[PDB]
Curated annotation (Swiss-Prot), chain C:
<feature type="binding site">
    <location>
        <position position="7"/>
    </location>
    <ligand>
        <name>L-glutamate</name>
    </ligand>
</feature>
<comment type="subunit">
    <text>Homotetramer or heterotetramer of pore-forming glutamate receptor subunits. Tetramers may be formed by the dimerization of dimers. May interact with MPP4. Forms a ternary complex with GRIP1 and CSPG4. Interacts with ATAD1 in an ATP-dependent manner. ATAD1-catalyzed ATP hydrolysis disrupts binding to ATAD1 and to GRIP1 and leads to AMPAR complex disassembly. Interacts with GRIP2. Interacts with GRIP1. Interacts with NSF via its C-terminus. Interacts with CACNG2, PICK1 and GRIP2. Interacts with GRIA1 and SYNDIG1. Part of a complex containing GRIA2, NSF and NAPA and/or NAPB.</text>
</comment>
<feature type="binding site">
    <location>
        <position position="5"/>
    </location>
    <ligand>
        <name>L-glutamate</name>
    </ligand>
</feature>
<comment type="similarity">
    <text>Belongs to the glutamate-gated ion channel (TC 1.A.10.1) family. GRIA2 subfamily.</text>
</comment>
<comment type="function">
    <text>Ionotropic glutamate receptor that functions as a ligand-gated cation channel, gated by L-glutamate and glutamatergic agonists such as alpha-amino-3-hydroxy-5-methyl-4-isoxazolepropionic acid (AMPA), quisqualic acid, and kainic acid. L-glutamate acts as an excitatory neurotransmitter at many synapses in the central nervous system and plays an important role in fast excitatory synaptic transmission.</text>
</comment>
<protein>
    <recommendedName>
        <fullName>Glutamate receptor 2</fullName>
    </recommendedName>
</protein>
<feature type="binding site">
    <location>
        <position position="12"/>
    </location>
    <ligand>
        <name>L-glutamate</name>
    </ligand>
</feature>
């Protein structure tokens, strides 16, 4: 099964990738 | 599940389940990095004590 | 129930239920925390 790993946008916990326009899936977000 | 930096509070623990903390943290203080202070007028006597 | 300074470890966790940590610690270091009267002659040898 697929688990929805919900998270909040906070620094330095989750950055918004600067090249996320062509990214999809789990690759959009990177962080702690 | 929620992988987020959530503070383990009493009201949250009563309604959700919290595991062991993955980081230790507390309240701290912000100050500016000490700048070079302007020398005093009578700062030529500094090398030797009063 | 055991109320003692017990560290929450992986081997202990799988067999014993550990409550919320009441204190935080870690490995630290410590060290051991009067000029002579005629110390003005120090720059040159006797």
């Amino acid at each position: 099964k697929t688990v929805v790993v919900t998270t909040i946008l906070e620094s330095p916990y989750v950055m918004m990738k600067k090249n996320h326009e062509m990214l999809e899936g789990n690759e959009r977000y990177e962080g702690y | 599940i929620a992988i987020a930096p959530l503070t383990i509070t009493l009201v949250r623990e009563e309604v959700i389940d919290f595991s062991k903390p993955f980081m230790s943290l507390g309240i701290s203080i912000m100050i500016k990095k000490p700048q070079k202070s302007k020398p005093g007028v009578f700062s030529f006597l500094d090398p030797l004590a009063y």
